[PDB]
Write a protein that binds this ligand. Structure first.
Ligand SMILES: [Zn+2]
Length: 241
DNA sequence: CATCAAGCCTTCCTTCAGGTGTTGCTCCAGAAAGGGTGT
């Protein structure tokens, strides 16, 4: 519940691969997940391929992967956590917009860990911190480390439901990009320029990029009700074995 | 060799063409597993 690699044996039960070396000597942190490798725990020397391009998100330059993050670099872990929230009892999916509606509005009370892929297969699990508090959520989205406050998401959603109550067409006040890629991601629309007051506009610039990315999955004409995502920890474990 | 004549009127544009067709984007921005084989 402290390091992102803890879910290897806390969220989902797993063990070392038994071809891993035993650490002898002084303390050194794992290159992935920033977990200190003590004396006696199993570790692997660093054998990343040339296709690994996340050297900028490595926690340390010790060139040693802890066994939990050896499990975390496995391909079934890589496509199993392409969109997943890992609570203290299981791994659930956030692929649907109703699942992100559940995650960023009334979050689960566990100290979870949120990963989401901005591409096909990405190293997501180890390079994000564990969110200890529901109010402050660390979301990994591709090369982006995002922080989402569900209270600010609730305030923006209440603002949007106020300015779009009674109207026939649900027009968004501020445009949000799902990929977080367009220039106008966070830019105020003309309808939102005419239908929001000044302090609401400064609020919509003042939100964090993670809240913008979350609102991108929950600001559209059909509004997703918070529905808990389907539990996928059985699918990941079966794939892992 | 000097002036006096040292213009006057009126015309002073008319119709119509006064766009048509197409184009109106393409692609990819991953990393590992599992095989080879070349130094
Ligand atoms: Zn680690």
């Amino acid at each position: 519940m402290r390091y992102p690699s803890d879910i290897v044996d806390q969220v989902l039960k797993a063990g070392p691969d038994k071809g891993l070396l035993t650490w002898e000597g002084v303390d050194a942190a794992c290159s992935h997940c920033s977990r200190p490798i003590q004396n006696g725990d199993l570790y692997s020397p660093s054998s990343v391929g040339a296709f690994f391009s996340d050297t900028r998100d490595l926690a340390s330059t010790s060139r040693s992967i802890c066994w939990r993050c050896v499990v975390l670099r496995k391909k079934p872990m890589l496509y199993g956590l392409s969109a997943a929230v890992v609570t203290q009892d299981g791994i659930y999916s956030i692929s649907k917009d109703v699942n992100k509606a559940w995650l960023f509005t009334t979050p689960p009370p566990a100290p979870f860990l949120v990963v989401h892929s901005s591409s096909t297969m990405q190293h997501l699990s180890w390079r994000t911190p564990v969110t200890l508090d529901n109010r402050r959520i660390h979301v990994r989205y591709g090369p982006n480390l995002f922080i989402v406050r569900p209270e600010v998401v609730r305030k923006a959603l209440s603002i949007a439901d106020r300015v779009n109550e009674g109207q026939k067409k649900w027009v968004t006040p501020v445009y949000f990009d799902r990929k977080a890629a367009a220039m106008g991601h966070g830019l105020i629309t003309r309808a939102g320029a005419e239908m929001l007051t000044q302090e609401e506009q400064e609020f919509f610039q003042s939100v964090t990029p993670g809240e913008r990315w979350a609102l991108s999955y929950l600001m559209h004409s059909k509004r997703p009700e918070p529905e808990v995502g389907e539990c996928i920890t059985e699918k990941v474990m079966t794939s892992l074995n």
